[PDB]
Scaffold this active site. Structure first.
Site, PDB file in Angstrom:
ATOM      1  N   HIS A 178       0.828  -1.208   0.000  1.00 53.38           N
ATOM      2  CA  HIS A 178       0.000   0.000   0.000  1.00 53.38           C
ATOM      3  C   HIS A 178       0.864   1.259   0.000  1.00 53.38           C
ATOM      4  CE1 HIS A 178       0.393  -0.132   4.537  1.00 53.38           C
ATOM      5  NE2 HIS A 178       0.342   1.186   4.404  1.00 53.38           N
ATOM      6  N   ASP A 209       0.007  -7.643   1.423  1.00 50.65           N
ATOM      7  CA  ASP A 209       0.433  -6.238   1.487  1.00 50.65           C
ATOM      8  C   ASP A 209       1.951  -6.171   1.629  1.00 50.65           C
ATOM      9  OD1 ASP A 209       0.190  -3.453   1.454  1.00 50.65           O
ATOM     10  OD2 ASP A 209      -0.335  -3.307   3.585  1.00 50.65           O
ATOM     11  N   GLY A 215       2.976   6.357   8.983  1.00 49.50           N
ATOM     12  CA  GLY A 215       4.252   6.423   8.298  1.00 49.50           C
ATOM     13  C   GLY A 215       5.266   5.379   8.757  1.00 49.50           C
ATOM     14  N   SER A 264       4.547   1.915   8.602  1.00 47.07           N
ATOM     15  CA  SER A 264       4.357   0.622   7.949  1.00 47.07           C
ATOM     16  C   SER A 264       5.655   0.246   7.231  1.00 47.07           C
ATOM     17  CB  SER A 264       3.168   0.656   6.991  1.00 47.07           C
ATOM     18  OG  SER A 264       3.387   1.523   5.903  1.00 47.07           O
TER      19      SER A 264
HETATM   20  C1  TSV Z   1      -6.669  -4.012   8.519  1.00 47.03           C
HETATM   21  C2  TSV Z   1      -7.557  -3.299   9.508  1.00 47.03           C
HETATM   22  C3  TSV Z   1      -7.738  -4.221  10.736  1.00 47.03           C
HETATM   23  C4  TSV Z   1      -8.912  -3.020   8.922  1.00 47.03           C
HETATM   24  O1  TSV Z   1      -6.974  -2.117   9.913  1.00 47.03           O
HETATM   25  C5  TSV Z   1      -6.762  -1.030   9.048  1.00 47.03           C
HETATM   26  O2  TSV Z   1      -6.847  -1.078   7.876  1.00 47.03           O
HETATM   27  N1  TSV Z   1      -6.332   0.166   9.652  1.00 47.03           N
HETATM   28  C6  TSV Z   1      -5.812   1.201   8.899  1.00 47.03           C
HETATM   29  C7  TSV Z   1      -5.790   2.488   9.731  1.00 47.03           C
HETATM   30  C8  TSV Z   1      -5.270   3.687   8.971  1.00 47.03           C
HETATM   31  C9  TSV Z   1      -4.961   4.818   9.916  1.00 47.03           C
HETATM   32  C10 TSV Z   1      -3.455   5.076  10.140  1.00 47.03           C
HETATM   33  C11 TSV Z   1      -2.707   4.084  10.996  1.00 47.03           C
HETATM   34  C12 TSV Z   1      -1.210   4.301  10.902  1.00 47.03           C
HETATM   35  C13 TSV Z   1      -0.310   3.370  10.675  1.00 47.03           C
HETATM   36  C14 TSV Z   1      -0.661   2.087   9.964  1.00 47.03           C
HETATM   37  C15 TSV Z   1       0.629   1.325   9.764  1.00 47.03           C
HETATM   38  C16 TSV Z   1       0.025   2.052   8.608  1.00 47.03           C
HETATM   39  C17 TSV Z   1       0.952   3.148   8.012  1.00 47.03           C
HETATM   40  O3  TSV Z   1       1.750   3.689   8.678  1.00 47.03           O
HETATM   41  N2  TSV Z   1       0.885   3.370   6.643  1.00 47.03           N
HETATM   42  S1  TSV Z   1       1.824   4.475   5.976  1.00 47.03           S
HETATM   43  O4  TSV Z   1       1.471   5.583   6.467  1.00 47.03           O
HETATM   44  O5  TSV Z   1       3.067   4.342   6.285  1.00 47.03           O
HETATM   45  C18 TSV Z   1       1.363   4.417   4.221  1.00 47.03           C
HETATM   46  C19 TSV Z   1       2.253   5.383   3.527  1.00 47.03           C
HETATM   47  C20 TSV Z   1       2.592   3.943   3.530  1.00 47.03           C
HETATM   48  N3  TSV Z   1      -0.832   1.334   7.715  1.00 47.03           N
HETATM   49  C21 TSV Z   1      -1.974   1.850   7.138  1.00 47.03           C
HETATM   50  O6  TSV Z   1      -2.266   2.966   7.296  1.00 47.03           O
HETATM   51  C22 TSV Z   1      -2.876   0.813   6.420  1.00 47.03           C
HETATM   52  C23 TSV Z   1      -3.134   1.107   4.838  1.00 47.03           C
HETATM   53  C24 TSV Z   1      -4.366   0.779   4.655  1.00 47.03           C
HETATM   54  O7  TSV Z   1      -4.576  -0.577   4.531  1.00 47.03           O
HETATM   55  C25 TSV Z   1      -4.149  -1.231   3.398  1.00 47.03           C
HETATM   56  O8  TSV Z   1      -3.984  -0.687   2.376  1.00 47.03           O
HETATM   57  N4  TSV Z   1      -4.050  -2.613   3.515  1.00 47.03           N
HETATM   58  C26 TSV Z   1      -3.974  -3.486   2.516  1.00 47.03           C
HETATM   59  C27 TSV Z   1      -3.875  -4.769   3.067  1.00 47.03           C
HETATM   60  C28 TSV Z   1      -3.789  -6.059   2.506  1.00 47.03           C
HETATM   61  C29 TSV Z   1      -3.741  -7.136   3.333  1.00 47.03           C
HETATM   62  C30 TSV Z   1      -3.732  -6.972   4.686  1.00 47.03           C
HETATM   63  C31 TSV Z   1      -3.838  -5.711   5.231  1.00 47.03           C
HETATM   64  F1  TSV Z   1      -3.840  -5.542   6.505  1.00 47.03           F
HETATM   65  C32 TSV Z   1      -3.898  -4.602   4.394  1.00 47.03           C
HETATM   66  C33 TSV Z   1      -4.021  -3.243   4.663  1.00 47.03           C
HETATM   67  C34 TSV Z   1      -5.101   1.221   5.934  1.00 47.03           C
HETATM   68  N5  TSV Z   1      -4.066   0.967   7.008  1.00 47.03           N
HETATM   69  C35 TSV Z   1      -4.377   0.922   8.359  1.00 47.03           C
HETATM   70  O9  TSV Z   1      -3.522   0.726   9.045  1.00 47.03           O
END
Ligand code: TSV
Ligand code: ZN
Length: 198
Positions: free
Chosen positions: A76, A100, A156, A158
């Site tokens: 992602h 992912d 940020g 992940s």
């Molecule tokens: C799964 C569940 C239980 C529903 O929860 C959530 O979806 N919650 C959200 C909460 C968002 C709020 C911020 C939280 C902050 C930090 C989160 C770590 C982070 C991040 O730092 N990204 S980034 O800024 O660095 C980015 C710049 C690189 N990831 C995200 O945001 C991810 C991205 C997005 O999900 C995905 O595209 N996929 C695709 C997948 C395929 C398979 C399995 C998966 F799981 C998948 C997850 C939503 N995400 C969450 O986390």
């Protein structure tokens, strides 16, 4: 039309999380202009060091972690992008949108973490701000924060590692579980999933 079609840039390493000494701290190795130019060309002559890299695209920034000679990060964040390197853009070696997860060959100069074999559930999550957050492993791919934080604190991060007490890689940080904007739990790609992928 076909002639004007743009190309996405490479992922660019813009810094690192320094874990070598007794203090963990973020280091930036490239500023926003250099990053944009490096993203376009795919040519990055900077020296790479360490296990956990801070990476950027034109539009996002996040982390990438070396394990067994592969630099791993999230789909992602990275999409299907190449990564900038001294000899030009390098094509992904692994791509799995269902997990992912993506990976490129680890850049020369990086150090790899060793996959955990301890079966331990006391983990540590490393953020892009070099915070080392205690996480209790709760299942194959989840863990609870011992001290909850607002989402903002994990955003940020992940692609960053979850480590065991021995400093082995247990997983790659993927997603956060929140209630009322407060992160209580994290999802990660378990290192065995990576080992399978390999
Ligand atoms: C799964 C569940 C239980 C529903 O929860 C959530 O979806 N919650 C959200 C909460 C968002 C709020 C911020 C939280 C902050 C930090 C989160 C770590 C982070 C991040 O730092 N990204 S980034 O800024 O660095 C980015 C710049 C690189 N990831 C995200 O945001 C991810 C991205 C997005 O999900 C995905 O595209 N996929 C695709 C997948 C395929 C398979 C399995 C998966 F799981 C998948 C997850 C939503 N995400 C969450 O986390
Ligand atoms: Zn271990």
């Amino acid at each position: 039309h076909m002639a004007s079609m743009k190309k996405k840039g490479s992922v660019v390493i813009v810094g690192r999380i320094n874990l070598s000494g007794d203090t963990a701290y973020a280091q930036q190795t490239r500023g926003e202009e250099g990053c944009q130019e490096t993203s376009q060309t795919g040519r990055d002559k900077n020296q790479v060091e360490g296990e956990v890299q801070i990476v950027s695209t034109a539009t996002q920034t996040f982390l990438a972690t070396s394990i067994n000679g592969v630099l791993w990060t999230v789909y992602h964040g990275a999409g299907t992008r190449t990564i900038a390197s001294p000899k030009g853009p390098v094509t992904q070696m692994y791509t799995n949108v269902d997990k992912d997860l993506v990976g490129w060959q680890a850049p020369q100069g990086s150090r790899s973490l060793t996959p955990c074999t301890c079966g331990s559930s006391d983990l540590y999550l490393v953020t892009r701000h070099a915070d080392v957050i205690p996480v209790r492993r709760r299942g194959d791919s989840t863990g609870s924060l011992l001290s909850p934080r607002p989402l903002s604190y994990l955003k940020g991060s992940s692609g960053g590692p979850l480590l065991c007490p021995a400093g082995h890689a247990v997983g790659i940080f993927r997603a956060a579980v929140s209630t009322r904007g407060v992160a209580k739990a994290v999802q990660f790609i378990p290192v065995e999933s990576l080992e399978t992928t390999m």
